[PDB]
Amino acid sequence: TVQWLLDNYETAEGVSLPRSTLYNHYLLHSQEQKLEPVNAASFGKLIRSVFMGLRTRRLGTRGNSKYHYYGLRIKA
Amino acid sequence: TVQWLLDNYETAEGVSLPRSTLYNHYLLHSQEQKLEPVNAASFGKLIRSVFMGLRTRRLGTRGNSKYHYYGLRIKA
DNA sequence: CGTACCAGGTAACG
DNA sequence: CGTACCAGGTAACG
Numbered sequence: 328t329v330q331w332l333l334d335n336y337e338t339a340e341g342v343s344l345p346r347s348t349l350y351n352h353y354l355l356h357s358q359e360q361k362l363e364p365v366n367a368a369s370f371g372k373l374i375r376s377v378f379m380g381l382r383t384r385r386l387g388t389r390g391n392s393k394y395h396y397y398g399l400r401i402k403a
Numbered sequence: 404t405v406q407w408l409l410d411n412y413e414t415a416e417g418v419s420l421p422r423s424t425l426y427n428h429y430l431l432h433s434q435e436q437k438l439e440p441v442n443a444a445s446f447g448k449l450i451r452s453v454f455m456g457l458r459t460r461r462l463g464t465r466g467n468s469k470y471h472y473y474g475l476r477i478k479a
Numbered sequence: 480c481g482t483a484c485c486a487g488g489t490a491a492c493g
Numbered sequence: 494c495g496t497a498c499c500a501g502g503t504a505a506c507g
Contacts, residue, residue, distance in 0.1 A: 346486085368486040368502055375485085385487090389494065392487080422500085444488055444500040451499085461501090465480065468501080 331356055332377050337402040343384055343395040349374075407432055408453050413478040419460055419471040425450075 335352070336344075350367050357364035365373065374396065375381060381399055385392040411428070412420075426443050433440035441449065450472065451457060457475055461468040 366486080366502060368484075369504080371485045385496075387495075390488095392495080394486085442488060442500080444498075445490080447499045461482075463481075466502095468481080470500085 328353065328356070328362070328373065329377055332374065333402075335402055336378070336399055338378050338380065338398055339400040340398070342400045343386070343397040344399050344401070345386075346371075346394045346396055349396065349399075404429065404432070404438070404449065405453055408450065409478075411478055412454070412475055414454050414456065414474055415476040416474070418476045419462070419473040420475050420477070421462075422447075422470045422472055425472065425475075 331353075336349070346367070350370050353370060354364050356362075364370075378396075378399055382397040384395045384397045386395050387393050407429075412425070422443070426446050429446060430440050432438075440446075454472075454475055458473040460471045460473045462471050463469050
């Protein structure tokens with residue numbers, strides 16, 4: 328899934344993506360390509376092996392904070 | 404609760420205690436002494452401010468691992 | 480078959 | 494009122 332990640336996302340400045348929607352997109356890709364998906368923790372290992380320097384933020388109002396990969400955006 | 408911790412537990416070698424039963428004992432102490440208990444994360448901050456050098460282990464058979472504070476035992 | 484490296488709650492920053 | 498420092502799953506060690 329390294330090339331699929333590179334084709335769909337890229338490191339960028341000052342923007343972030345919620346981790347769930349990114350993992351959710353990966354699960355569709357996996358299902359569509361008949362690949363058995365890894366879990367969210369394993370996916371975190373994969374994405375950090377592809378995109379260097381990602382930071383962790385938790386965005387949202389109190390009681391509603393959600394993890395984001397900071398420094399990443401949709402490429403296409 | 405610093406003195407209650409020191410009166411009931413001590414650092415020791417080669418032995419561990421499950422985190423849950425220790426926090427469960429703290430909750431009884433809190434209830435019995437009419438003190439509002441802090442949550443498990445806050446309790447982890449408290450116990451590490453009292454007992455220096457505690458290590459983390461997860462003991463148990465596959466699928467059943469549970470966190471332990473390694474290097475601690477019941478004093479009394 | 481019993482760790483490594485990834486993946487929310489409360490106090491308190493700013 | 495939107496981070497710091499605490500709190501299970503899978504691969505793979507040994």
